Coordinates of N, CA and C (backbone and C1' of nucleotides) in Angstrom, one line a residue:
Chain A
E409 N 121.9 140.3 92.7 CA 121.3 141.1 93.7 C 121.5 140.5 95.1
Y410 N 122.6 141.0 95.8 CA 123.0 140.4 97.0 C 121.9 140.4 98.1
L411 N 121.2 139.4 98.2 CA 120.1 139.3 99.2 C 120.6 138.5 100.5
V412 N 119.6 138.1 101.3 CA 119.9 137.4 102.6 C 119.0 136.2 102.6
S413 N 119.5 135.1 103.0 CA 118.7 133.9 103.1 C 118.1 133.7 104.5
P414 N 116.8 133.6 104.6 CA 116.2 133.3 105.9 C 116.5 131.9 106.4
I415 N 117.3 131.1 105.7 CA 117.7 129.7 106.1 C 119.1 129.7 106.5
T416 N 120.0 130.1 105.6 CA 121.5 130.1 105.9 C 121.9 131.5 106.2
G417 N 121.7 132.5 105.3 CA 122.1 133.8 105.4 C 123.0 134.3 104.4
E418 N 123.4 133.4 103.5 CA 124.3 133.8 102.4 C 123.7 134.7 101.4
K419 N 124.5 135.2 100.5 CA 124.1 136.4 99.7 C 123.7 135.9 98.3
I420 N 122.5 135.3 98.2 CA 122.0 134.7 96.9 C 121.2 135.8 96.1
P421 N 121.5 135.9 94.8 CA 120.9 137.0 94.1 C 119.4 136.7 93.6
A422 N 118.9 137.7 92.8 CA 117.5 137.8 92.6 C 116.9 136.5 92.0
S423 N 117.4 136.0 90.9 CA 116.8 135.0 90.2 C 117.0 133.6 90.9
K424 N 118.2 133.3 91.3 CA 118.4 132.0 91.9 C 118.0 131.9 93.3
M425 N 117.6 133.0 93.9 CA 117.0 132.9 95.3 C 115.7 132.1 95.3
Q426 N 114.8 132.2 94.3 CA 113.6 131.4 94.3 C 114.0 129.9 94.3
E427 N 114.8 129.4 93.4 CA 115.3 128.1 93.5 C 115.9 127.7 94.8
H428 N 116.6 128.6 95.4 CA 117.1 128.3 96.7 C 116.0 128.0 97.7
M429 N 114.9 128.8 97.7 CA 113.7 128.5 98.5 C 113.1 127.2 98.2
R430 N 113.3 126.6 97.0 CA 112.8 125.3 96.7 C 113.7 124.2 97.1
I431 N 115.0 124.5 97.2 CA 116.0 123.5 97.5 C 116.3 123.4 99.0
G432 N 116.5 124.6 99.6 CA 116.8 124.6 101.0 C 115.7 124.1 101.9
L433 N 114.4 124.0 101.4 CA 113.3 123.5 102.2 C 112.9 122.1 101.7
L434 N 113.6 121.6 100.7 CA 113.3 120.2 100.2 C 113.5 119.2 101.3
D435 N 112.5 118.3 101.5 CA 112.5 117.4 102.6 C 113.6 116.3 102.5
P436 N 114.5 116.1 103.4 CA 115.5 115.0 103.3 C 114.9 113.7 103.2
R437 N 113.7 113.5 103.8 CA 113.0 112.2 103.6 C 112.6 111.9 102.2
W438 N 112.5 113.0 101.4 CA 112.2 112.8 99.9 C 113.3 112.0 99.3
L439 N 114.5 112.3 99.6 CA 115.7 111.6 99.0 C 115.6 110.1 99.4
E440 N 115.4 109.8 100.7 CA 115.2 108.4 101.1 C 114.1 107.7 100.4
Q441 N 112.9 108.4 100.3 CA 111.8 107.8 99.6 C 112.1 107.5 98.1
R442 N 112.8 108.5 97.4 CA 113.1 108.2 96.0 C 114.1 107.1 95.8
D443 N 115.2 107.1 96.7 CA 116.1 105.9 96.7 C 115.4 104.6 97.0
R444 N 114.5 104.6 97.9 CA 113.7 103.4 98.2 C 112.9 103.0 97.0
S445 N 112.3 103.9 96.3 CA 111.5 103.6 95.1 C 112.4 103.1 94.0
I446 N 113.6 103.7 93.8 CA 114.5 103.1 92.8 C 114.9 101.7 93.2
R447 N 115.2 101.5 94.5 CA 115.7 100.1 94.9 C 114.6 99.1 94.8
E448 N 113.3 99.5 95.0 CA 112.2 98.6 95.0 C 111.6 98.3 93.6
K449 N 111.7 99.4 92.7 CA 111.0 99.3 91.5 C 112.0 99.0 90.3
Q450 N 113.2 98.7 90.6 CA 114.2 98.3 89.6 C 114.8 96.9 89.9
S451 N 114.5 96.3 91.0 CA 114.9 94.9 91.3 C 113.8 93.9 91.0
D452 N 112.8 94.3 90.2 CA 111.7 93.4 89.9 C 111.9 92.6 88.6
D453 N 111.7 91.3 88.7 CA 111.7 90.5 87.5 C 110.5 90.8 86.6
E454 N 110.7 90.8 85.3 CA 109.7 91.1 84.3 C 108.6 90.0 84.4
Chain B
rA1 P 110.9 154.3 133.5 O5' 109.4 153.8 134.1 C5' 108.8 152.7 133.6 C4' 107.3 152.7 133.9 C3' 106.5 151.7 133.2 O3' 106.4 150.5 134.0 C1' 105.5 153.7 132.8
rG2 P 106.6 149.0 133.3 O5' 105.3 148.2 133.9 C5' 104.3 147.7 133.0 C4' 103.0 148.4 133.2 C3' 101.9 148.0 132.4 O3' 101.3 146.8 132.9 C1' 101.9 150.3 132.3
rC3 P 101.0 145.5 131.9 O5' 99.7 146.0 131.0 C5' 98.5 146.4 131.6 C4' 97.6 147.0 130.5 C3' 97.4 146.2 129.3 O3' 96.5 145.2 129.4 C1' 97.8 148.5 128.8
rU4 P 96.8 143.8 128.7 O5' 96.6 144.1 127.1 C5' 95.4 144.6 126.6 C4' 95.5 145.2 125.2 C3' 96.0 144.3 124.1 O3' 95.0 143.5 123.6 C1' 97.2 146.3 124.1
rU5 P 95.4 142.1 122.8 O5' 95.8 142.6 121.4 C5' 94.8 143.3 120.6 C4' 95.4 143.6 119.2 C3' 96.1 142.5 118.5 O3' 95.2 141.6 117.9 C1' 97.5 144.4 118.4
rU6 P 95.5 140.1 117.7 O5' 96.6 140.1 116.5 C5' 96.3 140.6 115.2 C4' 97.5 140.8 114.3 C3' 98.3 139.5 114.2 O3' 97.8 138.6 113.3 C1' 99.7 141.4 114.6
rG7 P 97.8 137.0 113.7 O5' 99.2 136.5 113.2 C5' 99.6 136.7 111.8 C4' 101.1 136.8 111.6 C3' 101.9 135.6 112.3 O3' 101.8 134.4 111.5 C1' 103.0 137.6 112.8
rC8 P 101.8 133.0 112.2 O5' 103.4 132.8 112.5 C5' 104.4 133.0 111.6 C4' 105.7 133.1 112.2 C3' 106.2 132.0 113.1 O3' 106.6 130.9 112.4 C1' 106.7 134.1 114.1
rG9 P 106.5 129.4 113.0 O5' 107.9 129.2 113.7 C5' 107.9 128.3 114.9 C4' 109.0 128.8 115.8 C3' 109.1 128.1 117.1 O3' 109.8 126.8 117.1 C1' 109.3 130.4 117.5
rC10 P 109.0 125.5 117.5 O5' 109.4 125.3 119.0 C5' 110.7 125.6 119.4 C4' 110.8 126.0 120.8 C3' 110.0 125.2 121.9 O3' 110.6 124.0 122.2 C1' 109.7 127.5 122.3
rA11 P 109.9 122.6 122.1 O5' 109.3 122.4 123.6 C5' 107.9 122.6 123.9 C4' 107.7 123.4 125.1 C3' 106.5 123.0 126.0 O3' 106.7 121.8 126.8 C1' 106.6 125.3 125.8
rG12 P 105.7 120.6 126.8 O5' 104.6 121.1 127.9 C5' 105.0 121.5 129.1 C4' 104.0 122.3 129.8 C3' 102.6 121.7 129.8 O3' 102.4 120.7 130.7 C1' 102.5 124.0 129.3
rU13 P 101.3 119.5 130.4 O5' 99.9 120.1 130.6 C5' 99.5 120.7 131.8 C4' 98.3 121.5 131.7 C3' 97.1 120.8 131.1 O3' 96.4 120.0 132.1 C1' 97.2 123.0 130.1
rG14 P 95.7 118.6 131.6 O5' 95.3 118.9 130.0 C5' 94.2 118.4 129.4 C4' 93.2 119.4 129.1 C3' 92.2 119.1 128.0 O3' 91.1 118.2 128.5 C1' 93.0 121.2 127.6
rG15 P 90.7 116.9 127.8 O5' 89.8 117.4 126.6 C5' 88.7 118.2 126.8 C4' 88.2 118.9 125.6 C3' 88.0 117.9 124.4 O3' 86.8 117.2 124.4 C1' 89.2 119.9 123.7
rC16 P 86.8 115.7 123.8 O5' 86.8 116.0 122.2 C5' 85.8 116.8 121.6 C4' 86.1 117.2 120.2 C3' 86.5 116.0 119.2 O3' 85.3 115.4 118.8 C1' 88.1 117.7 119.0
rA17 P 85.3 113.8 118.5 O5' 86.1 113.7 117.2 C5' 85.6 114.3 115.9 C4' 86.4 113.9 114.8 C3' 86.9 112.4 114.8 O3' 85.9 111.6 114.2 C1' 88.8 113.8 114.4
rG18 P 86.1 110.0 114.1 O5' 87.3 109.8 113.0 C5' 88.1 108.7 112.9 C4' 89.2 108.8 111.9 C3' 89.9 107.5 111.6 O3' 90.4 107.4 110.3 C1' 91.5 109.0 112.5
rU19 P 89.5 106.6 109.2 O5' 89.7 107.5 107.9 C5' 89.6 108.9 107.9 C4' 89.3 109.4 106.5 C3' 88.0 110.3 106.5 O3' 88.2 111.4 105.6 C1' 87.9 108.5 104.9
rA20 P 87.8 112.8 106.0 O5' 89.2 113.3 106.8 C5' 90.3 113.7 106.0 C4' 91.6 113.2 106.7 C3' 92.9 113.8 106.3 O3' 93.1 115.1 106.9 C1' 93.1 111.5 106.3
rU21 P 94.0 116.2 106.3 O5' 95.5 115.8 106.7 C5' 95.8 115.6 108.0 C4' 97.2 115.0 108.2 C3' 98.3 115.5 107.3 O3' 98.9 116.7 107.8 C1' 98.3 113.2 107.2
rC22 P 99.5 117.8 106.8 O5' 100.7 117.1 106.1 C5' 102.0 117.1 106.7 C4' 102.8 116.0 106.1 C3' 103.5 116.2 104.8 O3' 104.7 117.1 105.0 C1' 102.7 114.0 104.8
rG23 P 105.0 118.1 103.8 O5' 105.8 117.3 102.7 C5' 106.9 116.5 103.0 C4' 107.3 115.6 101.9 C3' 107.5 116.3 100.6 O3' 108.7 116.9 100.4 C1' 106.3 114.2 100.4
rU24 P 108.8 118.4 99.7 O5' 108.7 118.1 98.1 C5' 109.4 116.9 97.6 C4' 108.9 116.5 96.3 C3' 108.9 117.7 95.3 O3' 109.2 117.3 94.0 C1' 106.7 116.7 95.5
rA25 P 110.1 118.3 93.1 O5' 111.5 117.5 92.9 C5' 112.7 118.2 93.2 C4' 113.6 118.2 91.9 C3' 114.1 116.9 91.4 O3' 114.1 116.9 90.0 C1' 115.9 118.3 91.9
rG26 P 113.2 116.0 89.1 O5' 111.9 116.9 88.7 C5' 110.7 116.8 89.4 C4' 109.6 116.6 88.4 C3' 108.9 117.9 87.9 O3' 109.5 118.5 86.9 C1' 107.3 116.3 88.6
rC27 P 109.3 120.1 86.6 O5' 107.8 120.2 86.2 C5' 107.3 119.8 85.0 C4' 105.9 120.1 84.8 C3' 105.4 121.5 85.0 O3' 105.7 122.4 83.9 C1' 103.9 120.1 86.1
rC28 P 106.0 124.0 84.1 O5' 104.6 124.5 84.5 C5' 103.5 124.5 83.6 C4' 102.2 124.9 84.2 C3' 102.1 126.2 84.9 O3' 102.1 127.4 84.1 C1' 101.0 124.6 86.2
rA29 P 102.8 128.7 84.5 O5' 101.9 129.2 85.8 C5' 100.6 129.6 85.6 C4' 100.0 130.0 87.0 C3' 100.7 131.0 87.8 O3' 100.6 132.3 87.4 C1' 100.0 129.2 89.2
rA30 P 101.9 133.3 87.4 O5' 101.3 134.6 88.0 C5' 100.5 134.6 89.2 C4' 99.6 135.8 89.3 C3' 100.3 137.1 89.7 O3' 99.7 138.2 89.1 C1' 98.7 136.6 91.3
rU31 P 100.5 139.3 88.4 O5' 100.7 138.8 86.9 C5' 99.9 139.3 85.8 C4' 100.1 138.6 84.6 C3' 100.3 137.1 84.7 O3' 99.7 136.5 83.5 C1' 102.2 138.0 83.6
rG32 P 98.1 136.0 83.5 O5' 98.0 135.4 85.0 C5' 98.5 134.2 85.3 C4' 97.8 133.5 86.4 C3' 96.4 132.9 86.0 O3' 96.1 131.7 86.7 C1' 96.2 134.5 87.8
rA33 P 95.5 130.5 85.9 O5' 95.2 129.4 87.0 C5' 96.3 128.5 87.4 C4' 95.9 127.8 88.7 C3' 94.5 127.3 88.7 O3' 94.4 126.0 88.1 C1' 94.9 128.4 90.7
rG34 P 93.2 125.8 87.0 O5' 91.9 126.0 87.9 C5' 91.5 125.0 88.9 C4' 90.6 125.6 89.9 C3' 89.2 125.9 89.5 O3' 88.4 124.7 89.5 C1' 90.1 127.7 90.8
rG35 P 87.6 124.3 88.1 O5' 86.2 125.0 88.3 C5' 86.0 126.4 88.1 C4' 85.2 127.1 89.2 C3' 83.9 127.7 88.8 O3' 82.8 126.8 88.7 C1' 85.1 129.3 90.0
rU36 P 81.9 126.8 87.4 O5' 80.4 126.8 87.9 C5' 80.0 125.7 88.7 C4' 78.7 126.0 89.4 C3' 78.6 127.3 90.1 O3' 78.2 128.4 89.2 C1' 78.0 125.7 91.6
rU37 P 78.5 129.9 89.6 O5' 77.3 130.3 90.6 C5' 76.0 130.2 90.2 C4' 75.0 130.4 91.3 C3' 74.9 131.8 91.9 O3' 73.5 132.0 92.3 C1' 75.5 130.3 93.6
rU38 P 72.9 133.5 92.3 O5' 73.9 134.4 93.2 C5' 73.6 135.7 93.6 C4' 74.6 136.7 93.1 C3' 75.7 136.1 92.2 O3' 76.0 137.1 91.2 C1' 76.7 137.2 94.0
rA39 P 75.3 137.0 89.7 O5' 76.5 137.4 88.7 C5' 77.2 138.6 88.9 C4' 78.4 138.7 87.9 C3' 78.1 138.5 86.5 O3' 79.0 139.3 85.7 C1' 79.6 136.8 87.1
rU40 P 78.3 140.5 84.8 O5' 79.6 141.5 84.6 C5' 80.8 141.2 85.2 C4' 81.6 142.5 85.3 C3' 80.9 143.7 85.9 O3' 81.8 144.5 86.6 C1' 81.6 144.2 83.7
rC41 P 81.4 145.0 88.1 O5' 81.0 143.7 88.9 C5' 82.0 142.8 89.1 C4' 81.6 141.7 90.1 C3' 82.7 141.1 91.0 O3' 82.9 141.9 92.1 C1' 81.4 139.3 90.0
rC42 P 84.3 141.6 92.9 O5' 83.9 140.5 94.0 C5' 84.9 139.8 94.7 C4' 84.6 138.4 94.9 C3' 85.7 137.5 95.4 O3' 86.0 137.7 96.8 C1' 84.6 136.4 93.7
rG43 P 87.3 138.3 97.3 O5' 88.4 137.2 96.9 C5' 88.1 135.8 97.1 C4' 89.2 134.9 96.5 C3' 90.6 135.3 96.8 O3' 91.3 134.0 97.0 C1' 90.3 135.3 94.4
rA44 P 91.4 133.5 98.5 O5' 92.9 133.4 98.8 C5' 93.8 133.0 97.9 C4' 93.8 131.5 97.7 C3' 95.1 130.8 98.1 O3' 94.8 129.4 98.5 C1' 94.9 130.6 95.8
rG45 P 95.1 128.8 99.9 O5' 96.4 127.9 99.6 C5' 96.2 126.6 99.1 C4' 95.7 126.6 97.7 C3' 95.7 125.3 96.9 O3' 94.6 124.5 97.2 C1' 96.7 127.0 95.6
rG46 P 94.6 122.9 97.1 O5' 94.6 122.6 95.5 C5' 93.4 123.0 94.8 C4' 93.7 122.9 93.3 C3' 94.1 121.5 92.9 O3' 93.1 120.6 92.7 C1' 95.6 123.1 91.9
rC47 P 93.3 119.0 93.0 O5' 94.1 118.5 91.7 C5' 93.5 118.7 90.4 C4' 94.5 118.3 89.4 C3' 95.2 116.9 89.5 O3' 94.4 115.9 89.1 C1' 96.8 118.5 89.0
rG48 P 94.4 114.4 89.8 O5' 95.8 113.8 89.3 C5' 96.0 113.5 87.9 C4' 97.5 113.3 87.6 C3' 98.2 112.2 88.5 O3' 97.9 110.9 88.1 C1' 99.5 114.1 88.4
rC49 P 97.7 109.7 89.2 O5' 99.2 109.5 89.8 C5' 100.3 109.1 88.9 C4' 101.6 109.2 89.6 C3' 101.8 108.5 90.9 O3' 102.1 107.1 90.7 C1' 102.5 110.7 91.1
rG50 P 101.6 106.1 91.8 O5' 102.4 106.4 93.1 C5' 103.9 106.3 93.1 C4' 104.5 106.7 94.4 C3' 104.0 106.1 95.7 O3' 104.4 104.8 95.9 C1' 104.3 108.4 96.0
rA51 P 103.6 103.8 96.8 O5' 103.9 104.3 98.3 C5' 105.2 104.3 98.8 C4' 105.2 104.8 100.2 C3' 104.1 104.2 101.1 O3' 104.5 102.9 101.7 C1' 104.1 106.5 101.4
rU52 P 103.5 101.7 101.8 O5' 102.6 102.1 103.0 C5' 103.2 102.4 104.3 C4' 102.2 103.1 105.2 C3' 100.8 102.4 105.3 O3' 100.9 101.3 106.2 C1' 100.6 104.8 105.1
rU53 P 100.3 99.9 105.8 O5' 99.0 99.7 106.7 C5' 99.0 99.6 108.1 C4' 97.8 100.1 108.8 C3' 97.6 101.6 108.7 O3' 96.2 101.9 108.7 C1' 97.8 100.9 111.0
rA54 P 95.4 102.1 107.3 O5' 95.2 103.7 107.2 C5' 96.3 104.6 107.1 C4' 95.8 106.0 107.1 C3' 95.0 106.4 108.3 O3' 95.3 107.8 108.7 C1' 93.8 106.9 106.3
rU55 P 96.5 108.1 109.8 O5' 97.5 109.0 109.0 C5' 98.5 108.4 108.2 C4' 99.8 109.1 108.4 C3' 100.8 108.2 109.1 O3' 101.5 107.3 108.3 C1' 100.8 110.4 110.1
rU56 P 102.0 105.9 108.8 O5' 103.1 106.2 109.8 C5' 104.4 106.8 109.4 C4' 105.2 107.3 110.6 C3' 105.6 106.2 111.5 O3' 106.7 105.5 111.1 C1' 104.8 108.1 112.7
rG57 P 107.3 104.3 111.9 O5' 108.3 104.9 113.0 C5' 108.7 104.2 114.1 C4' 109.0 105.1 115.3 C3' 109.1 104.4 116.6 O3' 110.4 104.0 116.9 C1' 107.6 106.2 116.8
rC58 P 110.7 102.4 116.8 O5' 111.3 102.1 118.2 C5' 110.5 101.6 119.2 C4' 110.3 102.6 120.3 C3' 109.9 101.9 121.7 O3' 111.0 101.5 122.4 C1' 108.4 103.7 121.2
rU59 P 111.2 100.0 122.7 O5' 110.4 99.8 124.1 C5' 110.5 100.7 125.1 C4' 109.4 100.6 126.1 C3' 108.9 99.2 126.4 O3' 109.7 98.5 127.3 C1' 107.1 100.6 126.0
rA60 P 110.0 96.9 126.9 O5' 108.7 96.2 127.5 C5' 108.2 96.4 128.9 C4' 106.8 96.0 129.0 C3' 106.4 94.6 128.6 O3' 106.7 93.7 129.6 C1' 104.8 96.3 127.8
rA61 P 106.8 92.1 129.1 O5' 105.4 91.6 128.9 C5' 104.4 91.6 130.0 C4' 103.1 91.1 129.5 C3' 103.1 89.8 128.7 O3' 103.1 88.6 129.6 C1' 101.8 91.4 127.6
rU62 P 104.0 87.3 129.1 O5' 103.3 86.8 127.8 C5' 102.0 86.3 127.9 C4' 101.4 86.1 126.5 C3' 102.2 85.1 125.6 O3' 101.9 83.7 125.9 C1' 101.6 87.1 124.4
rA63 P 109.9 75.9 130.6 O5' 109.6 77.4 130.7 C5' 109.6 78.0 132.0 C4' 110.6 79.1 132.2 C3' 110.7 79.7 133.6 O3' 111.5 79.0 134.5 C1' 110.7 81.4 131.9
rC64 P 110.7 78.2 135.7 O5' 111.9 77.5 136.5 C5' 111.6 76.4 137.4 C4' 112.7 75.3 137.2 C3' 114.0 75.6 137.8 O3' 114.6 74.4 138.3 C1' 114.3 75.2 135.5
rU65 P 115.6 74.3 139.6 O5' 117.0 74.3 138.9 C5' 117.4 73.3 138.0 C4' 118.4 72.3 138.7 C3' 119.2 71.5 137.8 O3' 120.4 72.1 137.3 C1' 118.3 70.1 139.4
rU66 P 121.0 71.7 135.8 O5' 122.6 71.7 136.1 C5' 123.1 70.9 137.1 C4' 124.6 71.1 137.3 C3' 125.2 70.5 138.6 O3' 125.6 69.2 138.4 C1' 125.9 72.8 138.4
rU67 P 125.6 68.1 139.6 O5' 126.9 68.5 140.5 C5' 128.2 68.4 139.9 C4' 129.3 69.1 140.8 C3' 129.6 68.3 142.1 O3' 131.0 68.5 142.4 C1' 128.8 70.4 142.6
rU68 P 132.0 67.2 142.3 O5' 132.0 66.7 143.8 C5' 132.9 67.2 144.8 C4' 132.6 66.7 146.1 C3' 132.4 65.2 146.3 O3' 133.0 64.8 147.5 C1' 130.4 66.2 147.1
rC69 P 134.2 63.7 147.5 O5' 133.6 62.4 148.4 C5' 134.4 61.3 148.6 C4' 134.5 61.0 150.1 C3' 134.0 59.7 150.6 O3' 135.0 58.6 150.4 C1' 133.3 61.4 152.0
rC70 P 134.6 57.4 149.4 O5' 135.6 56.2 150.0 C5' 135.1 55.2 150.8 C4' 135.3 55.6 152.3 C3' 134.7 54.6 153.3 O3' 135.4 53.5 153.5 C1' 134.1 56.9 153.9
rC71 P 134.7 52.1 153.8 O5' 135.7 51.4 154.9 C5' 136.1 52.0 156.1 C4' 136.5 51.1 157.2 C3' 137.3 49.8 156.7 O3' 138.1 49.4 157.7 C1' 135.2 49.2 157.8
rA72 P 139.7 49.5 157.5 O5' 140.3 48.6 158.7 C5' 140.3 49.1 160.0 C4' 139.5 48.2 160.9 C3' 140.3 46.9 161.3 O3' 141.2 47.0 162.3 C1' 138.0 46.4 160.6
rA73 P 142.4 46.0 162.5 O5' 142.4 45.5 164.0 C5' 143.5 45.1 164.7 C4' 143.3 44.9 166.1 C3' 144.5 44.5 167.0 O3' 144.3 45.0 168.3 C1' 142.9 42.7 167.1
rU74 P 145.4 46.1 168.9 O5' 145.6 45.6 170.4 C5' 145.8 44.3 170.7 C4' 145.4 44.0 172.1 C3' 145.2 42.5 172.5 O3' 146.4 41.9 172.8 C1' 143.4 43.8 173.3
rA75 P 146.6 40.3 172.5 O5' 146.8 40.2 171.0 C5' 148.0 39.5 170.4 C4' 147.6 38.2 170.0 C3' 148.8 37.3 169.4 O3' 148.6 36.0 169.7 C1' 147.1 37.6 167.7
rC76 P 149.9 35.1 170.1 O5' 149.8 33.8 169.2 C5' 150.9 32.9 169.1 C4' 150.5 31.5 168.6 C3' 151.6 30.7 168.0 O3' 151.4 29.3 168.4 C1' 149.9 31.0 166.4

RNA sequence: AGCUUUGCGCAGUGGCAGUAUCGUAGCCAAUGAGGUUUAUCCGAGGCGCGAUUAUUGCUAAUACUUUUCCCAAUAC
């Protein structure tokens, strides 16, 4: 179902539109925080 | 042709509070979250996890000496 994105404007259909609204608004700082957590929580000695 | 309403942006001028702000390729949620009162009634976010000066950035405070010139006859 060729819809319109209020973020980009591409023609995303009915079902994957919802996921688009969860990804297109995902905070870029979340990626940095998750990579920081991986780097900090996996370099620890037992 | 002004007047005006709603929502959304960009700003400007203020006021208020730092026990709160944000994140959520984690989960659940109008096919119903949560319900202590008004329950054959109300009606949205909630939980877990994470960051932190209980939002985050800047700006400023916490010192003087290198050089470079020299003495001499109108004489056996």
